[PDB]
Amino acid sequence: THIWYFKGVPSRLGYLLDLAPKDLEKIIYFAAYVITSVDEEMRHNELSTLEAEMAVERKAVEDQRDGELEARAQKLEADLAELEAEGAKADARRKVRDGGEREMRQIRDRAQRELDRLEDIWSTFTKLAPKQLIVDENLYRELVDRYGEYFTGAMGAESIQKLIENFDIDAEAESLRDVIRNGKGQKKLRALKRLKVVAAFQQSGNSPMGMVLDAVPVIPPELRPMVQLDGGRFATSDLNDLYRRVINRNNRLKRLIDLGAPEIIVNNEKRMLQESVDALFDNGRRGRPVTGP
């Protein structure tokens, strides 16, 4: 992505894609996953069937937890009866009873952990729509495992590209015009700004896809003159240094993807690459500027 946009004030991407800067920058920094597209009508047709499957699975976890609770409660009751038969002191009775009660509390709480996870999964499944965010990778891993069928989501600069190219401008422009036709100044000003940006896009005759680059150019060599000192040292404009960094990192990416490796290293390295291009198009725009000497 082009540093001049996701960092600019106003951030053209934020207004066009109606995302807060925090959410946008997160994707740029390979921080959290994002949901791209969802066949909501396709989920709707079986929403009842999905809920029924939920009922049976949640009842299954209910049955296993109830069985565990019954087993442990019977065990504790038998232990207490045995201790009474042995005529031990009430101190031992309370020790065993507290141990068993805490065990059952832990069991019930773990059952509740599973149940609340299940309802979180559901909530996020039903009230699911584009531009939503999932901070924690584990929950997304779970979602794609249980229900990897409807919503396709991935985090990268390319996530945004697919979202925008799939996105349409005229419909949003009409909706914003309709909102403006109404009142409610508070939201009306935001509608005005977004409509201005979208109308500029539409009139330009271009497409937003220009905000995601795939081929940066390089200026001629003379513009970045190369200088030889008494010892032939390279002390010319650092433009050569920045291009060196970008090219080197791209070649590392290519070699690594050729060799094959898990997702973490790809992304970690990609985040690094994103930072280099942002630095080259501008140093010090955001974050610590690079400093060699």
């Binding site: 082009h2 220009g210 680059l213 940066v216 150019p217 198009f281």
Partner: peptide
């Protein structure tokens, strides 16, 4: 800087 600067001689 990716800014297509045309001339529009017309």
């Amino acid at each position: 800087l990716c800014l297509n600067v045309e001339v529009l001689s017309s």
